[PDB]
Design a protein around this ligand. Structure first.
Ligand SMILES: [Mg+2]
Ligand SMILES: [Mg+2]
Ligand SMILES: [Mg+2]
Ligand SMILES: [Mg+2]
Ligand SMILES: [Mg+2]
Ligand SMILES: [Mg+2]
Ligand SMILES: [Mg+2]
Ligand SMILES: [Mg+2]
Ligand SMILES: [Mg+2]
Lengths: 150, 117, 51
RNA sequence: CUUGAGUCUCGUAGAGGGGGGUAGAAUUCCAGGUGUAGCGGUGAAAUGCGUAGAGAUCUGGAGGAAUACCGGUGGCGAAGGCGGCCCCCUGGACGAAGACUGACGCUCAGGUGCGAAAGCGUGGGGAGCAAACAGGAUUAGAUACCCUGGUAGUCCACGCCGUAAACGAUGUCGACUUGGAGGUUGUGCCCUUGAGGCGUGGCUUCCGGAGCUAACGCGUUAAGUCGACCGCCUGGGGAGUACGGCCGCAAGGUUAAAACUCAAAUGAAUUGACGGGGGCCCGCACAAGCGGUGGAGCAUGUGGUUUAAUUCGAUGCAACGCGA
């Protein structure tokens, strides 16, 4: 409520050296078990070398293309009840946003595993099935389609 | 069909609502649409970012006709009496000038004691 | 309240008449008149105006 | 006699009062072009209006109320008052040189008269607000608050009532008493060259000196310092009510008790708390995120329960895997 530090730098992929991806492989790990992440996502990225076989490294940033919201619903309280004033989001959260729900919906599927309950929704998400982009448009339908108050 | 080219417009803007009625130089009507006459209702409407999507509704019923240029009346204050005029000119419209035609007594009748919230 | 000009350039100047009426003489008329409140509004909200 | 009251003169500003005109704006209702699924409205909604064409919108007529702007912190009158403009009949107030009579004088119970609003009369008109009334919604609920409509009645004379926080909750008339920024009027003189400049009379708005003041404050417009007269006041409730007279179409007005009864009812002023009052922070407060509870078994504490007893204490944030 009065401290403007910034963001806490994080350690890269154990091979590629990816800080932008350094923060993805952080919201996947349960109870600080980076022994079941560095071998379920850093590996469920090379099993997309079967969902196509192509260069899986940039074959990330595009699965997060139709999945990055840019205007959001930031509430308020003036008038007599509420205020929705939907407004834009900055990059310090953009890259991250999708990353989350992207794995989130990718949990409550029901696939054969989770090295697979993730190698699936990071292609489907890139194809517009799954809650990946349906969330995206479950939102924008309300956000920026509600600039009467914004 | 006539194809006017020099007809008028009337922007009546109450607080909880605002209508856009396109008429001719003389006064005869031509086309119209309005706030509640477009999707949003209640008080979700009224806001300016609603009362110009109406404006751009009159455009599709006032281009069946010929209007190479127009003028406007703003009978009524409120939430959509400027913004209304914005999606005007731009959506493919000329404009001589603006004329205000809002009420003005010389103290003649009593008004609604109304809102005693 | 008369505007209109030459050289098409959707200018402005509609505000020039924004300060000789507008909502101005509408607030006075909007809901109700004043009656006794002007007995204490021009002769009372005047303590507002002495410097 | 003349400075007090005044009479004439001669100026002057002003919503002073009554009557008679009036022009412009503005809603609403009428009459038709247009035009289409809509308008109206609340927090949202509903009631009501619209395919028997609302509303928008135009061109026309009927009609009633009121005079934005100017407007003022202003102006007037004895108060309640009173706002465009025009016309006649009519008050008051102010001033300048003077010109005049000669203490007329200021006070007044009863006496008489004027009387915001509301209401009762007779009769008129009735555009808009609207008690009462009916829907509508909100709530437990709503005889209310907002929504939709609407009778009286706001308006007119003629007449009654004759009370209001009738205000400045502060009689009148008269001379005093430090000033300081003004408002509006009237008349002297200044190269009147001038916006203005300087003296001086009525009114007036704010500060505020002594002084008065129980404090807040009044303070040249006194709540200062004196002088004539009249009004009222004597503790709260019971009560301006009852009882008699009066007035009054009435509704009611006014003249005004007793009996009980309580240690208080009050004024201003500080002290904090509390505001569904404001302004400014602070916390995992919240927002942003991660996890979990309620739900499922089981351990366990507690109030229920029943007991021959289920041993006493803890009972919102402060107690409940708590003292065990
Ligand atoms: Mg006076
Ligand atoms: Mg009356
Ligand atoms: Mg009503
Ligand atoms: Mg003082
Ligand atoms: Mg008292
Ligand atoms: Mg902490
Ligand atoms: Mg939270
Ligand atoms: Mg969670
Ligand atoms: Mg005890």
């Amino acid at each position: 409520r009065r401290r403007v530090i910034g963001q806490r730098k994080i350690l890269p992929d154990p091979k590629f050296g990816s800080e932008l991806l350094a923060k993805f492989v952080n919201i996947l790990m349960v109870d600080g078990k980076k022994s079941t992440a560095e071998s379920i996502v850093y590996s469920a990225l090379e099993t997309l070398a079967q969902r196509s076989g192509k260069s899986e490294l940039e074959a990330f940033e595009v699965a997060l293309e139709n999945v990055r919201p840019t205007v959001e619903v930031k509430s308020r309280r003036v008038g007599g009840s509420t205020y929705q004033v939907p407004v834009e989001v900055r990059p310090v959260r953009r890259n991250a946003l999708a990353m989350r729900w992207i794995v989130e919906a990718a949990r409550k599927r029901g696939d054969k595993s989770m090295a697979l309950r993730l190698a699936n929704e990071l292609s489907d998400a890139a194809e517009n099935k799954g809650t990946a982009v349906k969330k995206r448009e479950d939102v924008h339908r309300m956000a920026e389609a509600n600039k009467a108050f914004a | 069909r006539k194809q006017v080219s020099d007809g008028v417009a009337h922007i009546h803007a109450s607080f909880n609502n605002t209508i856009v009625t396109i008429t001719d130089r003389q006064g005869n009507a031509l086309g119209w649409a309005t706030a509640g006459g477009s999707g949003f209702r209640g008080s979700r409407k009224s806001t300016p970012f609603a009362a110009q999507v109406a404006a751009e509704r009159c455009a599709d019923a006032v281009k069946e006709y010929g209007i190479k240029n127009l003028e406007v009346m703003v009978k009524g204050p409120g939430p959509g009496r400027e913004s209304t005029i914005r999606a005007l000119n731009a959506a493919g419209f000329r404009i001589t000038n603006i004329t205000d035609v809002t009420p003005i007594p010389h103290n003649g009748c009593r008004p609604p004691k109304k809102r005693r919230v | 309240i008369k505007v209109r000009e030459n050289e098409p350039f959707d200018v402005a100047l509609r505000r020039f008449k924004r300060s000789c009426e507008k909502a101005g003489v509408l607030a006075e008329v909007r809901r109700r008149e004043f009656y006794e409140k002007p007995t204490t509004e021009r002769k009372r909200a005047k303590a507002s105006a002495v410097k």
